[PDB]
Amino acid sequence: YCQLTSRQKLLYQALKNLVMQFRKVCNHPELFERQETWSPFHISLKPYHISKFIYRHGQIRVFNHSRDRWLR
Amino acid sequence: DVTRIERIGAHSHIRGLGLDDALEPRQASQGMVGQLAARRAAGVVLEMIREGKIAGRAVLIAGQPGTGKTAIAMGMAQALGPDTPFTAIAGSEIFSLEMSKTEALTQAFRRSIGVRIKEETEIIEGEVVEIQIDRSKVGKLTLKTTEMETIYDLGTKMIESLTKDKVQAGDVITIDKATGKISKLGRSFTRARDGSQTKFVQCPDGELQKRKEVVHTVSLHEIDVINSRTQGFLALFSGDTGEIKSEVREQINAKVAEWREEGKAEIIPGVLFIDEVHMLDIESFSFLNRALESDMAPVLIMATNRGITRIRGTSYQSPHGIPIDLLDRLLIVSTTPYSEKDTKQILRIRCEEEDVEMSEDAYTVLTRIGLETSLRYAIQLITAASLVCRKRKGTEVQVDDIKRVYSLFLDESRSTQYMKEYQDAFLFN
Amino acid sequence: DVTRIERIGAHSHIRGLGLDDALEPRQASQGMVGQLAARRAAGVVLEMIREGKIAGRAVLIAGQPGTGKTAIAMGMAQALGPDTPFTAIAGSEIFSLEMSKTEALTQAFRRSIGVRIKEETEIIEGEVVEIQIDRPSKVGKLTLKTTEMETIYDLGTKMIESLTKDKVQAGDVITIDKATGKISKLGRSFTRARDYDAMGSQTKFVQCPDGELQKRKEVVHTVSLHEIDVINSRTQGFLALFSGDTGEIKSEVREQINAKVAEWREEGKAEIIPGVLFIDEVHMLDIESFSFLNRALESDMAPVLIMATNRGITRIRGTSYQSPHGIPIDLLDRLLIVSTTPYSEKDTKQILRIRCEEEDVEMSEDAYTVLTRIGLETSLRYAIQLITAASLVCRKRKGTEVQVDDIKRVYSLFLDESRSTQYMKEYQDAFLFN
Amino acid sequence: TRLKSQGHRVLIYSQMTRMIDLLEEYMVYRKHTYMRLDGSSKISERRDMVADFQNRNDIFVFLLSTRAGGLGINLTAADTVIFYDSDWNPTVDQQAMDR
Amino acid sequence: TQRIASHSHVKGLGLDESGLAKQAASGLVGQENAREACGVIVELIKSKKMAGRAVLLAGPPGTGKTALALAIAQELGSKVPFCPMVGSEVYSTEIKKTEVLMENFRRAIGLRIKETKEVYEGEVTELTPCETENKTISHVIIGLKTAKGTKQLKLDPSIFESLQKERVEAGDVIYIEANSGAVKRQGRCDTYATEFDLEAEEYVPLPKGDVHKKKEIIQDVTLHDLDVANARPQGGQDILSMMGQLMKPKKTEITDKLRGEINKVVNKYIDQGIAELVPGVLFVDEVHMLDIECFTYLHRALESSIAPIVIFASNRGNCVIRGTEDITSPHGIPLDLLDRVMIIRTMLYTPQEMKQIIKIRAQTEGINISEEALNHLGEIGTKTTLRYSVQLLTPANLLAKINGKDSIEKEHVEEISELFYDAKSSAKILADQQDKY
Amino acid sequence: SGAVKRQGRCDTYATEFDLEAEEYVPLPKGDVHKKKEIIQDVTLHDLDVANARPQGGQDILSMMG
Numbered sequence A: 001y002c003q004l005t006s007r008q009k010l011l012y013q014a015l016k017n018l019v020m021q022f023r024k025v026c027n028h029p030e031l032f033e034r035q036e037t038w039s040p041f042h043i044s045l046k047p048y049h050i051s052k053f054i055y056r057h058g059q060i061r062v063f064n065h066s067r068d069r070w071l072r
Numbered sequence B: 001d002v003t004r005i006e007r008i009g010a011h012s013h014i015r016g017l018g019l020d021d022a023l024e025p026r027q028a029s030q031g032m033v034g035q036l037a038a039r040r041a042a043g044v045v046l047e048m049i050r051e052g053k054i055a056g057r058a059v060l061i062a063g064q065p066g067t068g069k070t071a072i073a074m075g076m077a078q079a080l081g082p083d084t085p086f087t088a089i090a091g092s093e094i095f096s097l098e099m100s101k102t103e104a105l106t107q108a109f110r111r112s113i114g115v116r117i118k119e120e121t122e123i124i125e126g127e128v129v130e131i132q133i134d135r136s137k138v139g140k141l142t143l144k145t146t147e148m149e150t151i152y153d154l155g156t157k158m159i160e161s162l163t164k165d166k167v168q169a170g171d172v173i174t175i176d177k178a179t180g181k182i183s184k185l186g187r188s189f190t191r192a193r194d195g196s197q198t199k200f201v202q203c204p205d206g207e208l209q210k211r212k213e214v215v216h217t218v219s220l221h222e223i224d225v226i227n228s229r230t231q232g233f234l235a236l237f238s239g240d241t242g243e244i245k246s247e248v249r250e251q252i253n254a255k256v257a258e259w260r261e262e263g264k265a266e267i268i269p270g271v272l273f274i275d276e277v278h279m280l281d282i283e284s285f286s287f288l289n290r291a292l293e294s295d296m297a298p299v300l301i302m303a304t305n306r307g308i309t310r311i312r313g314t315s316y317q318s319p320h321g322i323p324i325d326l327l328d329r330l331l332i333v334s335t336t337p338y339s340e341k342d343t344k345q346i347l348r349i350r351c352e353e354e355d356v357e358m359s360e361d362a363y364t365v366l367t368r369i370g371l372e373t374s375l376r377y378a379i380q381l382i383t384a385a386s387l388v389c390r391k392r393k394g395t396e397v398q399v400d401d402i403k404r405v406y407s408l409f410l411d412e413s414r415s416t417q418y419m420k421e422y423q424d425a426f427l428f429n
Numbered sequence C: 001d002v003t004r005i006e007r008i009g010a011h012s013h014i015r016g017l018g019l020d021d022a023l024e025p026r027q028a029s030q031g032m033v034g035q036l037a038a039r040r041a042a043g044v045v046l047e048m049i050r051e052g053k054i055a056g057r058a059v060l061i062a063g064q065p066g067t068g069k070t071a072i073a074m075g076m077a078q079a080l081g082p083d084t085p086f087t088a089i090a091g092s093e094i095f096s097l098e099m100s101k102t103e104a105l106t107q108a109f110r111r112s113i114g115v116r117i118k119e120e121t122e123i124i125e126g127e128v129v130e131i132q133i134d135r136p137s138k139v140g141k142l143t144l145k146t147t148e149m150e151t152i153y154d155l156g157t158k159m160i161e162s163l164t165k166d167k168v169q170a171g172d173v174i175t176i177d178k179a180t181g182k183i184s185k186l187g188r189s190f191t192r193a194r195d196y197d198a199m200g201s202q203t204k205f206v207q208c209p210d211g212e213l214q215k216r217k218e219v220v221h222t223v224s225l226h227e228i229d230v231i232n233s234r235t236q237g238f239l240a241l242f243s244g245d246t247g248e249i250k251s252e253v254r255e256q257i258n259a260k261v262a263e264w265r266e267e268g269k270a271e272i273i274p275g276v277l278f279i280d281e282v283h284m285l286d287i288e289s290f291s292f293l294n295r296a297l298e299s300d301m302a303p304v305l306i307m308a309t310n311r312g313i314t315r316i317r318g319t320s321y322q323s324p325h326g327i328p329i330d331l332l333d334r335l336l337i338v339s340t341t342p343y344s345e346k347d348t349k350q351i352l353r354i355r356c357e358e359e360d361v362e363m364s365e366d367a368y369t370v371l372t373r374i375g376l377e378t379s380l381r382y383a384i385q386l387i388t389a390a391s392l393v394c395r396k397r398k399g400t401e402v403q404v405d406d407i408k409r410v411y412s413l414f415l416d417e418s419r420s421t422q423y424m425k426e427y428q429d430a431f432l433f434n
Numbered sequence D: 001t002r003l004k005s006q007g008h009r010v011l012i013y014s015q016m017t018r019m020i021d022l023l024e025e026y027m028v029y030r031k032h033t034y035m036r037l038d039g040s041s042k043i044s045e046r047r048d049m050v051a052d053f054q055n056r057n058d059i060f061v062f063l064l065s066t067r068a069g070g071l072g073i074n075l076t077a078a079d080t081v082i083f084y085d086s087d088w089n090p091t092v093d094q095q096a097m098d099r
Numbered sequence E: 001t002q003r004i005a006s007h008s009h010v011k012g013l014g015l016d017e018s019g020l021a022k023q024a025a026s027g028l029v030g031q032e033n034a035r036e037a038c039g040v041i042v043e044l045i046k047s048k049k050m051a052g053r054a055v056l057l058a059g060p061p062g063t064g065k066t067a068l069a070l071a072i073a074q075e076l077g078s079k080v081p082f083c084p085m086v087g088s089e090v091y092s093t094e095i096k097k098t099e100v101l102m103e104n105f106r107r108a109i110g111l112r113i114k115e116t117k118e119v120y121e122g123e124v125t126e127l128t129p130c131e132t133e134n135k136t137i138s139h140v141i142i143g144l145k146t147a148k149g150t151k152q153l154k155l156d157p158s159i160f161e162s163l164q165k166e167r168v169e170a171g172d173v174i175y176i177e178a179n180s181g182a183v184k185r186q187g188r189c190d191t192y193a194t195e196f197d198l199e200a201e202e203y204v205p206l207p208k209g210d211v212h213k214k215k216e217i218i219q220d221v222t223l224h225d226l227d228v229a230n231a232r233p234q235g236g237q238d239i240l241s242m243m244g245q246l247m248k249p250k251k252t253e254i255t256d257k258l259r260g261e262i263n264k265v266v267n268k269y270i271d272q273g274i275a276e277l278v279p280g281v282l283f284v285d286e287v288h289m290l291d292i293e294c295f296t297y298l299h300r301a302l303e304s305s306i307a308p309i310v311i312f313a314s315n316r317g318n319c320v321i322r323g324t325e326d327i328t329s330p331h332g333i334p335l336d337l338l339d340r341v342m343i344i345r346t347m348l349y350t351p352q353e354m355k356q357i358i359k360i361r362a363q364t365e366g367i368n369i370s371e372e373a374l375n376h377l378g379e380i381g382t383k384t385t386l387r388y389s390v391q392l393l394t395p396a397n398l399l400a401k402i403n404g405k406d407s408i409e410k411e412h413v414e415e416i417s418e419l420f421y422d423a424k425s426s427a428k429i430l431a432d433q434q435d436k437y
Numbered sequence F: 001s002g003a004v005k006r007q008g009r010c011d012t013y014a015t016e017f018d019l020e021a022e023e024y025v026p027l028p029k030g031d032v033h034k035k036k037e038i039i040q041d042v043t044l045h046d047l048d049v050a051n052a053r054p055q056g057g058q059d060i061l062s063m064m065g
């Protein structure tokens, strides 16, 4: 006499909430998925938008670049 | 039926601030009732900020706890209008171990002010009927829209961008002629026939290639982070940036001044808002004065619920929890408590906002609860009363159900009365 | 003459609690003497820990200074056994500038609980005959010899990379794991290494193994929940365990580790065993750690803990109001208090007699009268130090039996705290910040 | 595993074919050689698998089904028989064990 | 088996369908007004139409406030996220005290997301890079062999960088996904295990099924996990993401712009209907330990429209506010926050109701106690405290196992109560010997 | 300063390709070589900051920086 498990109790009790699939799923969890491939969820964020004027005149290195030359 | 990120709060029941061309507030407008002088002064401040011809002015809001001045502040923020800079912060939020209090407050003054810059760029968009590529590599594609049909030839880089993202026959996409990034907006209904089937977009209309003027507003703190850090998006979104040098900020201020002198771009003053300023350090209290005395400063409004109280850090008791130096720097607008006649009106409009059907005896007894106790407690009583009415299955809330909820939840004064009897058993009385 | 890392100490001589099978306390056993009440209660908590069916319990010990409150905790610590995990932490240790005090408390609770995992692996152990490698992937063979059987195996790419990385040459006894892939060279053969190249490298020699070449072994290990949480939190953080640089681990990772460990217990591959957390002088701990400890103890994985309190009726640090044992009433009422009765004159003679067998110092019968009187007027710790230095001066006089004159010499050399206070009152005006 | 130190023959009786396939996939990772007997493979492959059971190397077990394994013939070297569950038919356990 | 927990015997509030509180249900007795008061609260949380609500629990220590919190946690179910928090946890050296309270909301609110993934997996028969003039690799050519069939596919140089990162060689089984771009390696096929008698690499059998398979995966993630993923680039295919993966994961503050962007993308997911958002419940125990600054931020926090429901626990009466050094407030909570929170009154248990708790806990511990020992434990419990009689259950059972008795006896309870000391008696003993302390 | 900046490809070459990634600007008016007089003032703090710690701002394209 073999006792059931958590998967057999959840699959047996949750199914009653064809009936032969329960008789086939009583010994082992063939109907339900015991092993399923799992992968982490991937999320993509919208890329940052920077204006052309903010790119040309944006950085402070282009204004002081000659002053930075004098720093070197 | 779906639950949006936003849910009904205390300030969410009102939308906008009701005013008139003569600045005479209505008794009930835009969900707000009463406080004629408060809504008039706040309307004057709103028209001042909408003018935006001056800079570096402060105005304070004062009133008793429960007067809803925070609700008129959030309602003023809603009535401010889109595409205008606004920032909401609290007095306790500026304290952080990662960044100094002065760099955090100055960071708020930077986030408040913003700049509007307009550009023009050539962008192609439309449905792609066919694509051909021959491998340098030479290929040609067909761009068809409802109005016209065109054929284009691609270079090496364009062929690389095409082979990077595969596009099938008859797919509506947007091709940028500047960067070279191809983005597929959708698939045509007729061309998408015969896959994932993610989305469907109709064929675009108009000219294929147009020059669009892009209106883009950037923040001074955003530009300052972008320039200071190697990657300002990773610095700002990561939060690792802090203690930015003031020399770079001054250079950016001079360059923005040069931009305004050129006239190619314009600067838009922002609206800073500070909550619970009754408790704050004299370092920030003193720094607000000079920060407002700076050339370019946003227009701010601060809320203080408490009255005369000792400020934090010193043993001196300041009036209104603020030193006289900052008190004389700004103007104060005091709010009066709500009238009994306005209380039942607020209760009724909260019934309309929360979709609750009550009776006149319910509004009368709840009005008594508003007379003996603060209105917020009654607003918290009706919310739990609707559910008890649902358990009673009745289509209208009853005074008996209001008595059941009133028996379930007790006021702070009552909990104080029982806590006086059980206080000896409580720890550290 | 060889001295280990361990040396004689105050609580080190205790080999256990000295309890019977009935758990009734014995007067003298396992290096502990007297205090039948606290010995019996310590038996109750030891039998309770050995039961391990109940979790989330706190036991407090209180009494006068010098009653052996630490000696009892060391008694149950040594009597608990090597296979059962034990952790002894101090209130000042969990205070750190790198990580928060509550996080240190979580590291203590998750650190006390041990996890025992068994592993069965088949390894190959034998003496290498020859090693051949062909490089064009490199393919080579390895011929091994044992007294029972001589074998020949083929090597793959990763195997040749591992052996060449380990600098393995013919004539060395090595151990190769099939499933793991690790190779560990034990040594060289005497006869096979007797004839060597002119390089003449002398390192080590190992005799040829006997029996089957491939054998199945079982190696059991124990891993701490804090160790697993650091390893999996740092994303290959094996160095962060010994480095201690990790801190402020996210709670979600800890929850997932708890659920996965529960799943392992459901699978039966890994077993969970209880552990003990000893805290001494907890009265100085901040009240915030107490409020976090009361609610944090309600967890199912929270092990039983034991605290000790030296004083009573003292204000808590950070608060201006006094509380019994420097502990709030929520925690003080949350745990059981075990009071220790002060020792009597009859027990002191036996305590001082234990040092005779422990320190191997012959004591005369006349020395227990004056030494016992010094134990009555002064502290038993000062009596033990008087025994040690008295034995030093006894060796200085080269006598086998202790003489009273030597004890008077040590008593003249060292003064009690009360005496140092008496002279400190006369010279106190010249002393700084009187 | 207790029968591994013994080293007798083991036969598994499974009414469901999916349990036999999962038993082959689970037994394949354990390095345990075996053979599946069902109503799928041809009588030639089943005849070769039944004829290869004499002095079979490394195969200590056999997979069988109610009707397919209880069809007929015999298993000479088989000793230990394990039933996954009942066949929902009378005497089917004795007839399946008769092989 | 599972280790016994103090609150494990509490299965919920134990309320009927009419909302009234039964005398004994779900392992809880008494507190009919408190449980009946929570019966509307669980209907509010299950209703989800309201936000920014805080319910304070006021009661003496040991009256089951935490048992009511965890009882509601068990009543709402496993789908409703429940986040416990202690007042001492908000203090951290890495991040500010406010950032913890702000992150506890995102950690409270849960989100269910369905993701459709296309999977290409199987044995790799051939892999070769293409060569293009700038010696750069423009494209990758990799064939896939499976029991169903063989199909050659082309991959990008980034995917090739992940393959060379995984040390992928010909004859191995790999796992490739499209939208995420990550590359995994299952292992070498079992067919090649026979050529080498000894090999370090473990062998896995050849998978079955079509190479390309589209499948739906329903995962439950928290807005705080999403907020950390968007906050720091820990995961990814970038070499900088690998270096940061090697770096220590210290806590950092999240910007309000990132939070608003999260609200935007999640709002778009709700508009698409693929993602299902569920509200959470934030529990705060020992709220009197929280700082007045934390309360000051709780003013705006509770008034927020997106804030999940928060329950507070206060076991103390009038006390000095933390940091004020002067002003003392009821329940350690200032009048500003205390006016906003909703207070629930809790009453001490009666002598008759205590014995039932002692019996229920005695049965939960698995101990057989006679009626005499039950009446004695109830008597001494009413003399001092309930917690004491709760703690006296196990040791008396230990003495019963030692003496061989099947049940606890008055001599066992008398011996255990004789060994252990009550807080009152000990506090009285500290007075005589206080001079020696 | 010795710096080099690339504005874009000449407008005359824009008609050969129907689709090209490089932007096109008209031929800039003015002399090829322009002589101007610029007087720059630099505080000591910026010099001491750039020379205090390694700058690392030589190449932004580097992944290590």
Ligand SMILES: Nc1ncnc2c1ncn2[C@@H]1O[C@H](COP(=O)(O)OP(=O)(O)O)[C@@H](O)[C@H]1O
Binding pocket: B009, B010, B011, B013, B031, B032, B033, B034, B063, B064, B065, B066, B067, B068, B069, B070, B071, B072, B305, B346, B376, B379
């Ligand atoms: N003009 C108004 N009309 C209706 N209700 C209001 C109005 N102003 C405030 N309230 C009510 O006041 C509550 C918030 O008050 P609050 O801003 O906290 O007061 P205080 O600023 O004095 O603390 C809201 O729930 C809202 O229903």
Ligand SMILES: Nc1ncnc2c1ncn2[C@@H]1O[C@H](COP(=O)(O)OP(=O)(O)O)[C@@H](O)[C@H]1O
Binding pocket: C010, C011, C031, C032, C033, C034, C035, C063, C064, C065, C066, C067, C068, C069, C070, C071, C351, C380, C381, C384
């Ligand atoms: N039960 C005991 N048996 C033997 N020696 C003891 C016992 N209890 C205390 N001692 C001795 O007393 C000395 C001082 O004990 P101490 O650590 O001051 O006790 P407490 O920690 O209770 O103050 C120790 O060196 C120890 O050897």
Ligand SMILES: Nc1ncnc2c1ncn2[C@@H]1O[C@H](COP(=O)(O)OP(=O)(O)O)[C@@H](O)[C@H]1O
Binding pocket: E006, E007, E010, E027, E028, E029, E030, E031, E059, E060, E061, E062, E063, E064, E065, E066, E067, E315, E357
């Ligand atoms: N009404 C009740 N019925 C059953 N057990 C209770 C009840 N109230 C409290 N308890 C038990 O008493 C124990 C101690 O309660 P505690 O958490 O200290 O209460 P509080 O949180 O009010 O201080 C808890 O483990 C709980 O299981």
